[PDB]
């Protein structure tokens, strides 16, 4: 390192992870902090506009918010939306008042014309952004006017920004962020004489779209500069890379800089620029096109320099600003690492358990809404009065499901293992995406992230060779090593040294790894875990969501504004007959929703209704948040049957029909009161009264409503639940009946 | 009604002056039921439904510039038809009943 | 039945000086959807009450 | 006969600015971020063979 | 076996970004050049020169396949290409094939 002659490599003790700097700003959600959605609001005043416009600012990506500032500039639109918001037509003889008020509504329908005969093609959430920027803009441009006079203030909930995607790069994510802080949707400069020429007169429609459209002129230029500014600090981020690298060195000193010092001994930073990125080369085009072009020119001249330290420094500011560099030793979780050996005692291991925790949503309040009018059909506008009913989910631990997969996997002998392993190598599946083969390594390893959060997602970079592998494998791993080197243009290799006996030689290592007693050398960190002795009892730290649902607590005082954040129950009234219902209930061709299952006794196929209204509440559309989950309930049940269907074939009954009881028990017990009174007494048909055709009805009906609930209120997946509905089926009769008889017993109390 | 003593209508009334509006309005008050009654509260509550009821009440367009006379006569049959142009661009999904 | 006896619809409570504004002049439709939303805003209060 | 052929196309980021009409279309281009690479075989060997 | 593998193009090109290119007005156009040399390979081929016709194809080929063989073998990398078992030749025939 240092040398005399450009870069050698360095094994430093302590290489940093690089992390997202951990802010409290409420608008942002990273991969170890979520957050559902970002309270917002429209009208009320000038300054709250100005609030949220400034946090929109923040939120929408440039796309959105250059696509928008582009629609500013462009007069003819600009001309549509004002004259449409006043009520006169697009002409340039076309004259509003002074007195003139316009409301909030009167801005939106304004923007929406001109959006649908501007000609211009918008996705969904595209069309969104564009009408909050727009909006916010327009009645900006209106209060200083000012003709701006709001009715009310309305909360909506727009998204937080993404960064649960790229950990393992916090870089390129961070110069956008910052670039974004300077919008120009952030704080809007005027001129003041046309202002006041639009002021107090009657003035042409024309006048008014003139001086938006300049407005929109300069933000579009402002961005111009913001890219430039942004594509400076990649430029500058692509040459601290071919610097570490040393795909070309002129610079003899900046081995010295306290910032490119820190980013040679950043693992993150180093893979990324292994082999130059690209969109860090784009920014160079421009200066000199292609990157390597101007990779050439140093080359020729280290056998201007000014601009190169500037560079440099300029991107740093704000990778600091947002990325803090963290000691390899964290992230040593935040997975329950637990090793388990083949039956046939050795030194080698059949599995590796790792498991993810992170908090769940156990159950959703829901309320009691009316809806009030509103132009458009997309969105809509609800008010919500009171928390009438809280609804339950299934409330399932994942605990026992991956104690009963230890045992299996303790049970498995050095051999039936390395099958097990070649058989899902080839491409089978036979517990999904739980147990798959630890990704360059001859052992396998069962995971719980697969399938929550998508925490486990397979990118190839990382490890040298052909197997793929998840990130946070890989950040847990390494983070069990004591150094790492680093070469020039190579991965990065590392070493973990423990004393002493307490380490195993293995066949299942990667062919790259050196083995020692207390020793390991490879560029694989997941080869610390086959089979240096380490585990964690619980994982480190549990991964949190905040305002998971959105908070509509201060809902007395306004209404709110949604699009699938909240949803408002649409549910089937029963017709009001002693036996008119009986008459529907039976042709099972009927509207509202209702029990049907074939008794598992004989049987006779059963048919009763379910009265979601009684359950609701009489008169009531139960407005229900959507929760943005973490470990969904869908995507964990799914867990759960996959272990149940991965143990059935291993020859694993004891198990994998205890497993499905438990999941059994859970779905069927939630909602199984009403249930046994649903059933009293001649509404359900047909049975005769029986001790057992009886409680078999408090099952089914108990899962049925569950899953007729969650149609009705979007709380999980139907689908997900006719999936284990079908399995429970399948489950053996006197099981079945014994979960019947403890959901009956359970009821009478 | 009650179990015992049933009511086939009770008789009420359209326009005629401001206070026979008045006394139907009480009756109202207490027939119709909170939903329907809420309902329209919340419709009421809205600017912009109640700018298209009086707009086209009036016969002039729900817009910021958009001016009204004194002189104006407004009929029974002028409220109405205003309602229900509100209700169907309101965009709000009501029973027969409920409507 | 009770609470339904103090209903919103029974008795208009009304901001003296807005109607005076509306009466007898040219005045925009604005001013009356404006005026009439806050009451009914006032009914929705009256109602979260009941 | 022989002519200059072109061997690459630069590409260039834009965003799209509304217009009433469909048929012509207005376009704001930013950036270069790629050149486009062609083909790019010689025409000798060919008439060399022949 | 039928091998399928996902193109890629919004890394390529940018990851939020609208590609605008120019036409360009040609004298010599790719279409008509390419045109060219397989009139030329395939009169070859008649003729009873497979040394030439095949050796022209060859130079053509790695002319078409060569300027976008990368990602390409990175792209193939790995699971998403289907379906293959690492192998020397399986494995750069996709170099081809993408590129």
Redesign the interface.
Same mark, same amino acid.
């Given at each position: 390192v240092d040398t005399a002659k450009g870069v050698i490599p360095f094994s430093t003790s302590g290489a940093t992870w690089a992390v997202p700097r951990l802010s409290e700003d409420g608008i942002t959600s990273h991969f170890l902090r979520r957050r559902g959605y970002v309270t917002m609001t429209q009208g009320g005043s000038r300054d709250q506009n100005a609030a949220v416009r400034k946090i929109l600012s923040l939120i929408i990506?440039?796309?959105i918010q &250059? /696509?928008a500032c582009?629609?500013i500039?462009?007069e003819?639109?600009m001309r549509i939306t004002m004259a449409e &918001?006043?009520?006169?037509k697009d002409r340039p003889n076309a004259r =509003?008042?002074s007195? *003139?008020?316009?409301?909030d509504?009167?801005i939106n329908r304004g923007i929406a014309k001109?959006?649908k005969?501007?000609?211009?093609t918008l996705d969904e959430n595209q069309k969104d952004g564009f009408m909050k920027l727009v909006h916010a803009f327009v009645a900006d441009i209106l209060a200083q006017s000012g003709?701006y006079?709001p %009715? &009310?203030s309305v909360t909506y909930f727009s998204a937080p920004i993404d960064m649960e995607s790229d950990y393992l790069d916090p870089f390129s994510i961070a110069i956008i962020r910052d670039v974004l802080d300077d919008s120009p949707f952030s704080e809007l400069r005027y001129d003041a004489r046309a202002m006041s020429e639009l002021e107090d007169r009657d003035v042409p429609i024309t006048r008014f779209s003139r001086v938006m459209a300049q407005m929109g002129n300069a933000m579009?230029r402002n961005i111009?500069v913001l890219?430039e500014a942004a /594509?400076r600090k990649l430029r500058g981020l692509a040459v601290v890379g071919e610097i570490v690298h040393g795909r070309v060195r002129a610079p003899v000193r900046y081995l010295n800089d306290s910032f490119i010092q820190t980013l040679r001994s950043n693992i993150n930073f180093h893979l990324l620029t292994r082999t130059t990125p690209?969109?860090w080369a /784009?920014s160079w085009?421009?200066a000199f096109?292609?990157l390597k072009g101007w990779v050439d020119a140093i080359n020729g001249i280290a056998d201007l320099l000014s601009d190169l330290t500037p560079l440099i420094r300029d991107a740093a500011t704000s990778v600091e600003k947002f990325v803090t560099f963290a000691p390899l030793s964290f992230y040593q979780g935040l997975g329950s690492v637990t090793q388990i050996r083949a039956l046939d005692s050795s030194t080698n291991l059949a599995a590796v358990i790792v498991r993810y925790a992170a908090k769940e949503i156990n159950l959703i309040p829901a309320y009691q809404s009316?809806?009030?009018? =509103? %132009?458009?059909?997309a969105v809509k506008k609800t *008010?919500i009065?009171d928390q009438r009913l809280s609804l339950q989910l299934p409330e399932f631990s994942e605990d026992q499901f991956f104690g009963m997969l230890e045992q299996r996997m303790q049970n498995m002998s050095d051999s039936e293992v390395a099958e097990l392993v070649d058989r899902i190598a080839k491409g089978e599946t036979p517990f999904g995406d739980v147990v798959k083969q630890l990704p360059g390594t001859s052992t396998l390893l069962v995971t719980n992230g697969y399938y929550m959060g998508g925490l486990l997602t397979?990118e190839?970079k990382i490890i040298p060779g052909?197997?793929?592998v998840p990130a946070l494998l890989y950040m847990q791993a390494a983070s069990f090593a004591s150094s790492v080197r680093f070469p020039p243009g190579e991965y990065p290799v590392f070493h973990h040294e423990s004393s002493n006996g307490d380490v195993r030689l293995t066949d299942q290592v990667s062919a790259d790894a050196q083995l020692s007693h207390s020793a390991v050398e490879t560029a694989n960190p997941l080869n610390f875990l086959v089979a240096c002795n380490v585990s964690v009892h619980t994982p480190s730290i549990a991964i949190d969501i905040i305002e998971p649902m959105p908070d509509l607590t201060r809902r007395?005082t306004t209404e709110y504004v949604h699009k699938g954040e909240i949803k408002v129950a649409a549910i089937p009234s029963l017709p009001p007959k002693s036996a008119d219902r009986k008459a529907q209930v039976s042709r099972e061709t009927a509207k509202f929703e209702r029990v049907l299952y074939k008794a598992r006794k004989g049987g006779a196929q059963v048919a009763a209704p379910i009265d979601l209204e009684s359950l609701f509440g009489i008169?009531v559309n139960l407005a229900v948040p959507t929760v943005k989950h973490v470990y969904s309930p869908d995507s964990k049940t799914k867990l759960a049957l996959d272990i149940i269907k991965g143990l059935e074939s291993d020859g694993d009954k004891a198990a994998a029909t205890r497993l499905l009881m438990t999941l059994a028990r859970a779905y069927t017990g939630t909602y199984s009161s009403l249930a046994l009174r649903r059933r009293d007494e001649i509404t359900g048909i047909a049975a005769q009264p029986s001790d057992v055709a009886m409680q078999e009805f408090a099952l089914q009906s108990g899962v049925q409503t569950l899953k007729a609930v969650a149609k009705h209120t979007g709380i999980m997946e139907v689908a997900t639940i006719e999936m284990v509905e079908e399995k429970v089926r399948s489950l053996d009769d006197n099981r079945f009946y014994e979960i019947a008889a403890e959901v009956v017993l359970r009821a009478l109390k």
């Amino acid at each position: 390192v240092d040398t005399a002659k450009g870069v050698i490599p360095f094994s430093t003790s302590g290489a940093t992870w690089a992390v997202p700097r951990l802010s409290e700003d409420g608008i942002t959600s990273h991969f170890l902090r979520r957050r559902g959605y970002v309270t917002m609001t429209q009208g009320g005043s000038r300054d709250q506009n100005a609030a949220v416009r400034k946090i929109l600012s923040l939120i929408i990506a440039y796309d959105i918010q &250059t /696509q928008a500032c582009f629609f500013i500039s462009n007069e003819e639109s600009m001309r549509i939306t004002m004259a449409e &918001t006043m009520g006169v037509k697009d002409r340039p003889n076309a004259r =509003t008042n002074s007195w *003139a008020e316009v409301s909030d509504s009167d801005i939106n329908r304004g923007i929406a014309k001109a959006l649908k005969e501007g000609n211009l093609t918008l996705d969904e959430n595209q069309k969104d952004g564009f009408m909050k920027l727009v909006h916010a803009f327009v009645a900006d441009i209106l209060a200083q006017s000012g003709h701006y006079k709001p %009715v &009310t203030s309305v909360t909506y909930f727009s998204a937080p920004i993404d960064m649960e995607s790229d950990y393992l790069d916090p870089f390129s994510i961070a110069i956008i962020r910052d670039v974004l802080d300077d919008s120009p949707f952030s704080e809007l400069r005027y001129d003041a004489r046309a202002m006041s020429e639009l002021e107090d007169r009657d003035v042409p429609i024309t006048r008014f779209s003139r001086v938006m459209a300049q407005m929109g002129n300069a933000m579009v230029r402002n961005i111009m500069v913001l890219n430039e500014a942004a /594509q400076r600090k990649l430029r500058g981020l692509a040459v601290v890379g071919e610097i570490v690298h040393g795909r070309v060195r002129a610079p003899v000193r900046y081995l010295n800089d306290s910032f490119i010092q820190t980013l040679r001994s950043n693992i993150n930073f180093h893979l990324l620029t292994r082999t130059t990125p690209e969109r860090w080369a /784009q920014s160079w085009i421009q200066a000199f096109g292609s990157l390597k072009g101007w990779v050439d020119a140093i080359n020729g001249i280290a056998d201007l320099l000014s601009d190169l330290t500037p560079l440099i420094r300029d991107a740093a500011t704000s990778v600091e600003k947002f990325v803090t560099f963290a000691p390899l030793s964290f992230y040593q979780g935040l997975g329950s690492v637990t090793q388990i050996r083949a039956l046939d005692s050795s030194t080698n291991l059949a599995a590796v358990i790792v498991r993810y925790a992170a908090k769940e949503i156990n159950l959703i309040p829901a309320y009691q809404s009316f809806q009030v009018p =509103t %132009v458009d059909v997309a969105v809509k506008k609800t *008010a919500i009065m009171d928390q009438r009913l809280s609804l339950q989910l299934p409330e399932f631990s994942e605990d026992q499901f991956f104690g009963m997969l230890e045992q299996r996997m303790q049970n498995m002998s050095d051999s039936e293992v390395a099958e097990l392993v070649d058989r899902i190598a080839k491409g089978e599946t036979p517990f999904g995406d739980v147990v798959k083969q630890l990704p360059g390594t001859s052992t396998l390893l069962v995971t719980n992230g697969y399938y929550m959060g998508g925490l486990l997602t397979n990118e190839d970079k990382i490890i040298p060779g052909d197997a793929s592998v998840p990130a946070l494998l890989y950040m847990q791993a390494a983070s069990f090593a004591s150094s790492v080197r680093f070469p020039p243009g190579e991965y990065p290799v590392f070493h973990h040294e423990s004393s002493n006996g307490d380490v195993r030689l293995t066949d299942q290592v990667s062919a790259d790894a050196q083995l020692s007693h207390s020793a390991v050398e490879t560029a694989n960190p997941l080869n610390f875990l086959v089979a240096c002795n380490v585990s964690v009892h619980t994982p480190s730290i549990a991964i949190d969501i905040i305002e998971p649902m959105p908070d509509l607590t201060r809902r007395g005082t306004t209404e709110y504004v949604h699009k699938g954040e909240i949803k408002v129950a649409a549910i089937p009234s029963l017709p009001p007959k002693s036996a008119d219902r009986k008459a529907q209930v039976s042709r099972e061709t009927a509207k509202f929703e209702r029990v049907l299952y074939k008794a598992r006794k004989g049987g006779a196929q059963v048919a009763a209704p379910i009265d979601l209204e009684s359950l609701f509440g009489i008169a009531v559309n139960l407005a229900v948040p959507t929760v943005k989950h973490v470990y969904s309930p869908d995507s964990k049940t799914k867990l759960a049957l996959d272990i149940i269907k991965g143990l059935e074939s291993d020859g694993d009954k004891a198990a994998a029909t205890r497993l499905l009881m438990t999941l059994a028990r859970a779905y069927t017990g939630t909602y199984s009161s009403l249930a046994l009174r649903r059933r009293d007494e001649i509404t359900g048909i047909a049975a005769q009264p029986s001790d057992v055709a009886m409680q078999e009805f408090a099952l089914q009906s108990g899962v049925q409503t569950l899953k007729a609930v969650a149609k009705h209120t979007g709380i999980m997946e139907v689908a997900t639940i006719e999936m284990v509905e079908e399995k429970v089926r399948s489950l053996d009769d006197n099981r079945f009946y014994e979960i019947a008889a403890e959901v009956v017993l359970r009821a009478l109390k």
